[PDB]
């Protein structure tokens, strides 16, 4: 028969700082065992200091990003150019995704930005529009490789204070943008080694009060 | 694991915070209680999206009722709005097991179980362990009608811990709510990792473990 879905692989990573957020993704687009492109962006500036990535089936991901971008445009028209808050964007995306509940978008969506208090925010969605605000989220093929690392290295899970013997947890602390970018780079470097659908390049979008800026790092091409 | 039970002090509502995609742990920090209004709570079990979307939608429908009739919607009415909706989608593959918990002057403390099957049931205690829904608590031994509010909160907290331990798909943290006259009250989020060791040491239970 005709199968309307496909897997384009790739992996995305959202980390929220105190006064910043990052949304990173590899630039590799694959089909089966073939590489389609080594640099095909998957993380997009959507305006109003919101960055978005829908990772999975590339066609459904491109469609969703388009619809949300369009949703931001019509928010401005219908509400006197009001800035779309990240919590509002998140709720809007839930309705976009659930719209196609019985013919889903086969994508894992992460959006990053700043909350209305100016603090870093990451929101994570399932294919049918279930969403939740988080400090950390990896999505896509190598999510299972990266998330445990982020639990350990961002949230300091299973890490205790030396000389207590598990009596006092390591203190939770906001990471600097420079510390976060290291974890993103090491996460993807590690994922690239052990996942065949991850590699070629890494594009990171950093969100601050000043705006959206972009960093690119090469990954192994095998 | 969702628990909602009735007693002299009102309604206790206890839920875990784990979301699973097969054998993959998607999250350990999910809100499985929706705060519909100051006197109405909804528990969430089944499809994460189905519950989130339709119980949020229920909140909208409950708000329109208040504006049109200038009065708090009854738990019976609120439950039936959601039960009549899911029934329209019956067979389409909606997965939803919810307890609508609230207080009203008319009804008093009330718990309604609403199912994606279209089932709507009133009861003094409803439980969702694994993929099954029970008319009794996870333990049920400690249950007496005349229980202290802070004694009753423990039974709810302890009951989620019991299931969280044995069930692979239950865990993360326990979220506690106390429903009374003049609204509900949040009684905090308790990480199961820390709760388990504290409960073990104090209660002298979970001897089959070791630590």
């Amino acid at each position: 028969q005709f199968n309307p879905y496909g897997d384009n692989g790739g992996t995305i990573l959202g980390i929220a700082g105190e006064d910043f957020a990052v949304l990173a993704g590899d630039t590799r687009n694959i089909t089966d065992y073939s590489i389609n492109s080594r640099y095909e962006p998957k993380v997009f500036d959507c305006g109003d200091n919101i960055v978005m990535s829908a990772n999975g089936f590339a066609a459904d991901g491109d469609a969703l990003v388009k619809r949300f971008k369009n949703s931001v445009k019509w928010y401005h028209f219908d509400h006197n150019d009001k800035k779309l808050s990240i919590n509002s964007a998140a709720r809007n995306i839930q309705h976009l995704l659930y719209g196609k509940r019985f013919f889903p978008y086969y994508v894992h969506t992460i959006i990053a930005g700043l909350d209305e208090d100016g603090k870093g925010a990451v929101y994570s969605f399932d294919p049918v529009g279930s969403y939740e605000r988080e400090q950390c989220r990896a999505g896509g093929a190598a999510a299972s490789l990266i998330m445990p690392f982020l639990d350990n290295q961002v949230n300091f899970k299973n890490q205790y204070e030396p000389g207590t013997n598990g009596k006092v947890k390591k203190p939770l602390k906001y990471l600097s943008v420079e510390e976060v970018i290291k974890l993103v780079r090491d996460s993807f470097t590690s994922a690239t080694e052990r996942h065949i659908q991850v590699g070629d390049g890494l594009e990171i979008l950093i969100v601050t009060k000043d705006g959206v800026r972009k960093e690119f790092y090469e990954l192994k091409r095998d | 694991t969702t628990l909602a039970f009735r007693f002299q002090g009102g309604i206790i509502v206890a839920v875990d915070s784990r979301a699973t995609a097969g054998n993959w742990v998607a999250s350990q920090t999910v809100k499985k209680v929706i705060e519909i209004n100051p006197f109405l709570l909804g528990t969430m079990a089944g499809g994460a999206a189905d519950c989130q979307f339709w119980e949020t939608w229920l909140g909208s429908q409950c708000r329109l009722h208040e504006l049109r009739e200038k009065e708090r919607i009854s738990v019976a009415a609120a439950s039936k709005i959601l039960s009549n909706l899911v029934y329209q989608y019956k067979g389409a593959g909606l997965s939803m097991g919810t307890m609508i918990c609230g207080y009203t002057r008319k009804e008093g403390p009330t718990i309604y179980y609403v199912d994606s099957d279209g089932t709507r049931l009133k009861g003094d205690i409803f439980c969702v362990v694994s993929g099954q829904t029970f008319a009794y608590g996870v333990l049920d031994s400690n249950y007496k009608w005349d229980l202290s509010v802070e004694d009753a909160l423990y039974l709810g907290k302890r009951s989620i811990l019991a299931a969280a331990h044995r069930d692979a798909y239950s865990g993360g943290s326990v979220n506690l709510y106390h429903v009374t006259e003049d609204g509900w009250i949040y009684h905090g989020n308790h990480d199961v990792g820390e709760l388990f060791w504290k409960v073990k040491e104090e209660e002298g239970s979970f001897n089959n473990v070791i630590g």
Binding site: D126 | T20, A21, S27, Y169
Partner: peptide, 4 residues
């Protein structure tokens, strides 16, 4: 999709 995610699903207590």
């Amino acid at each position: 999709x995610a699903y207590x």
